[PDB]
Amino acid sequence: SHMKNSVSVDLPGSMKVLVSKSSNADGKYDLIATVDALELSGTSDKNNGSGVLEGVKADASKVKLTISDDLGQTTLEVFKSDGSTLVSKKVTSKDKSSTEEKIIIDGIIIEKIITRADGTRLEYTGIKSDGSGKAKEVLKGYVLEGTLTAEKTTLVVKEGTVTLSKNISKSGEVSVELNDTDSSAATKKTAAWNSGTSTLTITVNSKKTKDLVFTSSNTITVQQYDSNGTSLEGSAVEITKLDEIKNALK
């Protein structure tokens, strides 16, 4: 889009809007944006890019973009040609820590993508009316997979008899658990999670064997204990692939 005597205003996600530099005789600002090759326009009593823009598709469907007063959220709605029956709604919200994109069909959030400031992502797909769905965490070097419920996200790595589960609460808090079906005292893995240090300490045969640290950078490091299980030795090593998580679980 183009507008004479205008300013381009960045919006959450891929979008931008143009706002007039000055208001008209009635004090209203003009707004224009292109979304998916369709030009939308509107007017607003705000000077910053916020307000409502509309357009009409060739097939007669109405498109409406609503930009929140603080420019932190957009809602992109497609309606039937009546202009009021929803077909789809996409809400994108941005702040300093993340951008979240939600797709809502029939009042149900069916997809949610969170892109963190560091570029890693949580991708929730196939979400059902009960809040359950598929989850993927796209990290630096590898992807964890699992499931979503209305309670929490659980990403899972399985290695033989061992299952490592990384849970993410609704507030974004990470906790990790481990279960091993092995019933032998000499070889069964057990673990203790310390929420205060974001560290999972694995024990085998009554000795601590390694710490897995789940860092603020959304990475995992592994470090071994000495052969007595007393103190950490060597250096913590960043995990770069799923096979390295699994190696730690053998």
Same domain, 165 and 73: no
Beta strands in 36-117 (DSSP E): 38-44, 51-56, 62-67, 73-79, 86-94, 98-105, 108-116
Same domain, 98 and 162: no
Same domain, 68 and 162: no
Closest CA to 95 of 11, 219, 218: 11
Same domain, 6 and 96: yes
**Enclosing domain of residue 56:** 1-104
Give the span between the Cα atoms of 151 and 8, in whole angstroms. Answer: 40
Give the span between the Cα atoms of 131 and 220, in whole angstroms. Answer: 28
Q: Which CATH number do you get for residue 11?
A: 2.40.128.160
Give the span between the Cα atoms of 86 and 64, in whole angstroms. Answer: 11
89, 188 Cβ separation under 8 angstroms: no
Place of tokens 């009409």: 56
Place of tokens 């789940």: 214
The encoded tokens of residue 152 equal: 């929490």
Same domain, 20 and 114: no
Closest CA to 188 of 164, 211, 205, 208: 205
Identify the three-state secondary structure at position 248.
helix
Helices (H), the chain: 242-249
Q: First vs last Cα of the chain: how many Å apart? A: 57
Q: CA 214, 216, 219: angle at the middle one, nearest 5?
A: 50
Domain boundary among 54, 89, 104: 104
Identify the H or E element spanning 32.
Answer: strand 29-35
Resolution rounded to one decimal, in angstroms: 1.4
Give the span between the Cα atoms of 184 and 174, in whole angstroms. Answer: 29
Identify the three-state secondary structure at position 213.
strand
Give the span between the Cα atoms of 95 and 92, in whole angstroms. Answer: 10
Identify the H or E element spanning 138.
Answer: strand 133-138
